[PDB]
RNA sequence: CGGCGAAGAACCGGGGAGCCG
RNA sequence: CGGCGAAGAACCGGGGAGCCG
């Protein structure tokens, strides 16, 4: 219905909040790219460890290529309800449709656990 | 002072008007590049037959590089008093800092005699 | 019609956080 | 204090006349 086509699975809210929290914390020791241009290049260049996509992107066409791209490059991705939260999580002043963790820093294990839960959705 | 350093020699008013009438005619006969970006490239690419530099360009750094470039590339150049005149003559709606003839069309004689006039000064 | 635009519109690639009053 | 900016600022490269209300 209201959700655009590019949202391919439901991410429980607690999993979303863990993921947003880890994305904000990874900036302290690892490296994130933020925004759809850099997110897309991060995946295309083989650099993405975890891609975040906001569910409320409108027009959906801005991020709609990302899930199929991630799947082709075997990059895990997770949805978050709000591009506002996503922009806050990555530390910028405007909404953010998509982001990528590219260096996991000190959070390798927590991101690993999160990725295995994502897999467990489908 | 008041003219910027890039005005390396004086050009008389009969000649600047000669140069601007010629420029306006070469448009429907040959080819003109208009604007500093296109004029620099024409000189660098070896395509410029006559470049026009307005004397009232503020800031001067917009065009200051052009005279030594023209000399390096063996390209004659002429100063005209007004970038508004220069704009009107290349048929655009805004001021124009510099321009270049790239083909003389059917006005090869009037161009040559002006070029020899230019050579005569300094 | 005004405002802006060759001191470089649109558009494209690089870039990745400031620009303006 | 506002307006705008990750739906991509500044800037570099290509482009060469439109963009906006
Ligand atoms: Na980019
Ligand atoms: Na890593
Ligand atoms: Na760890
Ligand atoms: Na022309
Ligand atoms: Na031109
Ligand atoms: Na250019
Ligand atoms: Na102008
Ligand atoms: Na100008
Ligand atoms: Na880019
Ligand atoms: Na350019």
Numbering used by the authors:
A (entry chain C), B (entry chain D): -3 to 118
Can you quote the paper on this entry?
k-turns are highly abundant structural motifs in RNA that generate a tight kink in the axis of RNA, mediating tertiary contacts and serving as protein binding sites. k-turns play an important structural role in a number of key cellular RNA-protein complexes, including the box C/D snoRNP, where they bind the L7Ae (in archaea) or 15.5k protein (in eukaryotes) as the first stage of assembly. Sheared G:A base pairs are frequently found in key helical junctions in RNA structure, and most notably within the core of kink turns (k-turns) as tandem G:A, A:G base pairs. We have synthesized a series of variants of the standard k-turn Kt-7 from Haloarcula marismortui in which adenine has been substituted by N6-methyladenine. We have determined the crystal structure of one of these species both free and protein-bound, showing the environment of the methyl group and the way the modification is accommodated into the k-turn structure.
Crystals of self-complementary RNA containing two Kt-7 k-turns were obtained with and without bound AfL7Ae, at resolutions of 1.99 and 2.09 Å respectively. The structure of the k-turn containing N6-methyladenine 2b is closely similar in the L7Ae bound and protein free states, superimposing with an all-atom RMSD of 0.52 Å. The overall structure is very similar to that of AfL7Ae bound to unmodified Kt-7. The protein places its recognition helix in the widened major groove on the outside of the k-turn, making specific interactions with the conserved guanine nucleobases of the G:A base pairs and further non-specific backbone contacts. Its hydrophobic loop is located over the L1 and L2 nucleobases. The key cross-strand hydrogen bonds from L1 O2ʹ to A1n N1 and from -1n O2ʹ to A2b N3 are present; thus the structure adopts its normal N3 conformation. However, close inspection of the A2b:G2n base pair reveals some local conformational readjustment. In the 2b:2n base pair of the unmodified Kt-7, as well as the 1b:1n and 3b:3n base pairs of the modified Kt-7 both hydrogen bond lengths fall in the normal range of 2.8–3.1 Å. However that of N6-methyladenine 2b Kt-7 bound to AfL7Ae it is 3.7 Å and is thus beyond the range normally considered to be stably bonded. Superposition of the structures of N6-methyladenine 2b Kt-7 and unmodified Kt-7 shows that the disruption of the hydrogen bonding is primarily due to an in-plane rotation of A2b, leaving G2n essentially unaltered.
